[PDB]
Design a protein around this ligand. Structure first.
Ligand SMILES: CC(=O)N[C@@H]1[C@@H](O)[C@H](O[C@@H]2O[C@H](CO[C@]3(C(=O)O)C[C@H](O)[C@@H](NC(C)=O)[C@H]([C@H](O)[C@H](O)CO)O3)[C@H](O)[C@H](O)[C@H]2O)[C@@H](CO)O[C@H]1O
Ligand SMILES: CC(=O)N[C@@H]1[C@@H](O)[C@H](O[C@@H]2O[C@H](CO[C@]3(C(=O)O)C[C@H](O)[C@@H](NC(C)=O)[C@H]([C@H](O)[C@H](O)CO)O3)[C@H](O)[C@H](O)[C@H]2O)[C@@H](CO)O[C@H]1O
Ligand SMILES: CC(=O)N[C@@H]1[C@@H](O)[C@H](O[C@@H]2O[C@H](CO[C@]3(C(=O)O)C[C@H](O)[C@@H](NC(C)=O)[C@H]([C@H](O)[C@H](O)CO)O3)[C@H](O)[C@H](O)[C@H]2O)[C@@H](CO)O[C@H]1O
Ligand SMILES: *[C@@H]1O[C@H](CO)[C@@H](O[C@@H]2O[C@H](CO)[C@@H](O[C@@H]3O[C@H](CO)[C@@H](O)[C@H](O)[C@@H]3O)[C@H](O)[C@H]2NC(C)=O)[C@H](O)[C@H]1NC(C)=O
Ligand SMILES: *[C@@H]1O[C@H](CO)[C@@H](O[C@@H]2O[C@H](CO)[C@@H](O)[C@H](O)[C@H]2NC(C)=O)[C@H](O)[C@H]1NC(C)=O
Ligand code: NAG
Ligand code: NAG
Lengths: 321, 164, 321, 163, 321, 164
């Protein structure tokens, strides 16, 4: 009569590496490395990302006429741009502190557009009709929907002064622009004043802009330039615009409550109603495991990115059938 | 193996034993079969489960947006940002690789230890009432029925019952 | 007759965690985690911090009148601000590169204030007496102690030119300001010259300022603004001020030798004569152990901050009485 | 335990043995009592002390001010700075936790190994001059007085004398 | 008859540290720590670094007369400056975004200098002969080799207009300057026009510069200043210069394909024809081992820098002869 | 040592055995001498070689220029960059130091384990045909020529060839 001491074996083909030996076959093992994704852009924190259609963030904020797609959410957990986000600033120039703004707008809990300076009643002493072929809609010269091009009325551009008080109970993002004619002749033809300036001020913000007149190459067939500026106006504060020329005035602005800690994903992966805690440009991933090799640039609560193709932990023992 | 049992003086494992990691094969007049040792198997399972859970659950994950955007006059801080990401990448890849390599070895050592401890416990109770061949087996110097064989597996084996 | 082999047990209730098992009771153990602090702000490198009291760094440097009782040393190892540091720039406006200045002053060795442009002899043809309700002390209109508000003497503001050569054998921090009236009438009333400018120059620093006259919301009941500027003048170098108006002139400046690698602590904890190698806003901590859970923000040679509530190392063995 | 002695074939510890980690309990005609084994105990102490001091002393840092201040147009570098601080926090927290878990296991193994080694040394000396009970105890086949019991603890036990 | 079981011993004096015991002598071991270097600056990616001789990057780009070692390779993998690189901007002033430019030039391919505005044919209506004692060569007053100082011809400085189209199929780095005389008399003497301006424009660049006439300390005996500017002109783009005065015009420019991920080393170590994968300011190191204590600031594929003086891994066993 | 063989019940090593890490010393009428055990030696070499290569090769490196230049209005980001470099330095120094300390302990344990396993393997095949002296030696109860002891080292030793 005999009794023997022994250990389990099975049909497992699972292999792991050990410090002493490569590719050891074991009876049981577990994966520590998330190597797969769902190929989709999902909701983060139960909230969908902002989708801008044909436009980038600048075109959307300024109201590029090709952004007339009216459906933007009132809130978002991050922002998606694609290979199709082509419509930006249609009138050429610099968007100042653009990256800072994109970062600061990457998540919001409430967002609303409103008319800050109504076109019809705000500017009795100036011409509001300015358009440009550089921003066209339906084959006709047009302009940004959220800005207004002010020019001289009947050979006069008097000093303008316009103030807005923020009663919205949240931040107001105010955008404007400053136009830079290519020549001094164009300056006078538009604004009448060679010495023109733009002043913008609030309790926190103070800045003065003057036209920089230079012979320049045509961009989108425009020798002129427009620089774009913005500030976040606090609840209760006032913002005041003064100009003797060159002001591209706010028409519409945005009231919002900023979130924090989000960003922008650039991906052509399709947006879906799925939920995730971790989003990658390739698609969403499961966040339960400690490590992932899908992508280093992620948004969410995410496993740590590693270059590893395999991290597999032995649980059972050496399989010796 | 470190403890010399698995792929050791016990040459191979048992596909015949489905219900546990460690256990016994017995042979007597009543027949033969496999039985798992429930205590040692479960103790190992609890231990290994705790190891796996520690590696997974000790990882802190807070909401983070890794990406950053820089303009064309920001190259220096853009590359600073890249050095940060790549540096964390180097650290986590290296540490994760070696942690898994080192702890897999320890896990296989652990199983090896458990088989050895089980073998020696049985050896201790049987004493000279059985002959030690090798390959993990003991030949009794008496007849051991299913009730006797159970006492061996239960650790209740009665030595001066069978000293005969 | 018997001899037995065995091991120690005792009454220890100390527990540790192991990879295989939680909460194992052991006979002896040691703590790897510094979990306590002394509730004090202490000396780093044998030197006490700068305490600014009611004032922040801006108020201290400019000489906000509420700062006048601040007793400052010739050296400090770091700077403490409190929840009570409210007195800054009392006349509203921007302090340019403020965070940079704060960083660069966080530790210094030989710090001295001196009179760079004596009030009595530097300005025979300009008024030096300008004050404002915005910077008031004990209920009376006043001004920064280290700057002078220069205005016209008898209807004229002649072009001023003043130079300082740094013979101090160390860096000199020079601060000044530029005033921006709300109206052209104020401009003329103050400086007479609508065409006024301020130019500041040295071997390194070269900058020109012109008044920005615009309607702005009142801050501390001022529609006007003063922007504040600074530069570190190297040993042997010269700085030159020219102005036809709007200059808030240096009166006092600072000679110093900057240290490096320190910072600002914001804490309401009391400063004491104790010594530490690691300071936190909660208090000083022992730097002997490798890890600390007291505070993520430290100054010194410090244990690494961790989220752990317990790190305890077994020394003795399993306690089995 | 990995070496199968502590909480092993030796089921429990001795509160009665105050003066060391490892040792002996003897019983003879003259009486009974506890004695710590000084060599194995002190070697274990030296080893564990080196381990603790290694974990502590290998940490070296330089003078650093962690805090940074950024204005409202500096959000990106502010978040970069945060990514750095938080990344260091994740790495050190994870590594500290696991280092302690893993090394505590190794320390307990070490004690277990030491007890087993002591047991096997005595077994090796006594041979068939004593019987193995299984609780870590040896019953002599001769009489062992305090001088004899001391020789076992000292490693000087004379086998061919009591054969 | 006997057989014994045993293990190897030898004459090895190799020691390693273990967690339980220091200074254990072992039969075999391997070094994990690269502690030595070859004292040379070597090629990275099979390409030598740029060596600037007596000059820093600014002096090289502008053509400081004391450089005049004008021959650069068409490519380099990094840049070396030495304790001897002292010759920068010889005429005092500001070099805008200097660090960013140095970074962008740290590695390049297809790099070539070319004459963007030939001195002989480009300026029929202006004098090109302007020199200065501040930039001297061979004991005579001189000027930057890559710029031209344009001054009035016979009491007149007409408005100039000059354009360059980039047909080179790669980026063109264009450098220029703007001069700021110390007096209005100097302004008139040089350029005839008190109202002078310089305008520069391209698709991305837009600026109008105005002379700032002010009292300044003399640097290299110059009360005047020249500010230096640059832009990377994209393939196909045009850059246009207009001036009524004060233009320090481009003469030579550079065409290049910028590389990425490299940097600048400051070292007096000699450059050699050797190859390395890791460069330090002290010299090249083997990159095979995981750790190095040579230097934290490196360029290449480099072992991780550590403070360790010894990392030695036991391979063989405890040596007990 | 953890397994109690090296500097253990086997007190010292053999300068006389040049050709391997672990092995045998034999003495019979034909003479005496040393022989390395090739199976255990080569297995150890493969294992240790794999460990060293793991520590070296798991390190991942990309081309990096560590240095950055900042002007005198960039002090904050200059110190941020320094905090990154210093932070990586603290992490790599600490981890490299402890990895070497800990893995050297494991390497020496591994050797200890290998000697013990070799010893116990020889013990099992010889059984009572030999006497256990201590210090790792066996005294045969029969005469073992170079051909016989080779079978012991070969693992092919024939027990019921010999008796008494
Ligand atoms: C001030 C002015 O009208 N100047 C004339 C130049 O614009 C013109 O050069 C041609 O201008 C073309 C663009 O014409 C628009 C446009 O952008 O669509 C016409 C718009 O009505 C006008 N908008 C307003 C509010 O005035 C707009 C504007 O003048 C400029 O954008 C200001 O920078 O110009 C196009 O760019 C052609 O390529 C260009 O040659 C010349 C030649 O006719 O005459 C100028 O009087
Ligand atoms: C130049 C002048 O006196 N202008 C008068 C306006 O100041 C005044 O508007 C009121 O001004 C109030 C503040 O008055 C002070 C101040 O800051 O306390 C008075 C100071 O003496 C004066 N300082 C100097 C050197 O002249 C200072 C200064 O004018 C401004 O700071 C310049 O920007 O003003 C306060 O802001 C009130 O809210 C405001 O209505 C108007 C109306 O009475 O009269 C102007 O003559
Ligand atoms: C326009 C002119 O000639 N102005 C005279 C002043 O330059 C001169 O002041 C002295 O100038 C000294 C430097 O002289 C140079 C120079 O940099 O070497 C002479 C150069 O030929 C001239 N360059 C050109 C293109 O004309 C250059 C230039 O004027 C300045 O760089 C303009 O900023 O000046 C030196 O700086 C002395 O320290 C300074 O006193 C005064 C008095 O001699 O006469 C002016 O007519
Ligand atoms: C919104 O974005 C689209 C791009 O998807 C713009 O549409 C068209 O873009 C192409 C270039 O991708 C323009 O081509 C140009 O064609 C002219 C000849 O007409 C040629 O001379 C130029 O060199 C250039 O290649 C095209 O003109 C442009 N269409 C229009 C109507 O301008 C579109 O312009 C963008 N709209 C806004 C409002 O931003
Ligand atoms: C090139 O750099 C050298 C630095 O060595 C400059 O030489 C200095 O020139 C000043 C001004 O003439 C003298 O006062 C110093 O004595 C010189 N120093 C030395 C060490 O010789 C030289 O001026 C620079 N030249 C250019 C064109 O930049
Ligand atoms: C995440 O969800 C569960 C839990 O980890 C897992 O089974 C699943 O495979 C993961 N998702 C994907 C897409 O793999
Ligand atoms: C690095 O040094 C040389 C290169 O000259 C190389 O052969 C060697 O293998 C490397 N060092 C080690 C320890 O392998």
């Amino acid at each position: 009569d005999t009794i023997c001491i022994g250990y389990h074996a099975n049909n497992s083909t699972d292999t792991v590496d050990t410090v002493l030996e490569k590719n050891v076959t074991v009876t049981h093992s577990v994966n520590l490395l998330e190597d797969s994704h769902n190929g989709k852009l999902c909701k983060l924190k139960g909230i969908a990302p902002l989708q801008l259609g044909k436009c980038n963030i600048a075109g959307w904020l300024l109201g590029n006429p090709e952004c007339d797609l009216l459906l933007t959410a009132s809130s978002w957990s991050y922002i998606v741009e694609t290979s199709n986000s082509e419509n930006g600033t249609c009138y050429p120039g610099d968007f100042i502190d653009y990256e800072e703004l994109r970062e600061q707008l990457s998540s919001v809990s409430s967002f609303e557009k409103f008319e800050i300076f109504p076109k019809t009643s705000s500017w009795p002493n100036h011409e509001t009709t300015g358009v440009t072929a550089a921003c066209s809609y339906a084959g006709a010269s047009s302009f940004y929907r959220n800005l207004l091009w002010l020019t001289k009325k009947g050979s006069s551009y008097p000093k303008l002064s316009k103030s807005y008080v923020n009663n919205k109970g949240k931040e107001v993002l105010v955008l404007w622009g400053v136009h830079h004619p290519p020549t001094g002749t164009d300056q006078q033809s538009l604004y009448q004043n060679a010495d023109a300036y733009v002043s913008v001020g609030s309790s926190k913000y103070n800045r003065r802009f003057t036209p920089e007149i230079a012979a320049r190459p045509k961009v989108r067939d425009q020798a002129g330039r427009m620089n774009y500026y913005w500030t976040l106006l606090e609840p209760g504060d006032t913002i005041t615009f003064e100009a003797t020329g060159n002001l591209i005035a706010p028409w519409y602005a945005f009231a919002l409550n900023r979130g924090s800690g989000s960003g922008i994903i650039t991906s052509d992966a399709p947006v879906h109603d799925c939920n995730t805690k971790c989003q990658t440009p390739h698609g969403a991933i499961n966040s339960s495991l400690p490590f992932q090799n899908i992508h280093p640039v992620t948004i969410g609560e995410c496993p740590k990115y590693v270059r590893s193709t395999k991290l597999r932990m032995a649980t059972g023992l050496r399989n010796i059938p | 193996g470190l403890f010399g049992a698995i792929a050791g003086f016990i040459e191979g494992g048992w596909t015949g034993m489905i219900d546990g990691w460690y256990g016994y094969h017995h042979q007597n007049e009543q027949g033969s079969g496999y039985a798992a040792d429930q205590k040692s198997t479960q103790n190992a399972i609890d231990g290994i489960t705790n190891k796996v859970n520690s590696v997974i659950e000790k990882m802190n994950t807070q909401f983070t947006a890794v990406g950053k955007e820089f303009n064309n006059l920001e190259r220096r801080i853009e590359n600073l940002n890249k050095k940060v990401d790549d540096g964390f990448l180097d650290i986590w890849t290296y540490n994760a690789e070696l942690l898994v390599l080192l702890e897999n070895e320890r896990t296989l050592d652990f199983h090896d230890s458990n088989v050895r401890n089980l073998y020696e416990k049985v050896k201790s109770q049987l004493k000279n009432n059985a002959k030690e061949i090798g390959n993990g087996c003991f030949e009794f110097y008496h007849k051991c029925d299913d009730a006797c064989m159970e006492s061996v597996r239960n650790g209740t084996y009665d030595y001066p019952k069978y000293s005969e």
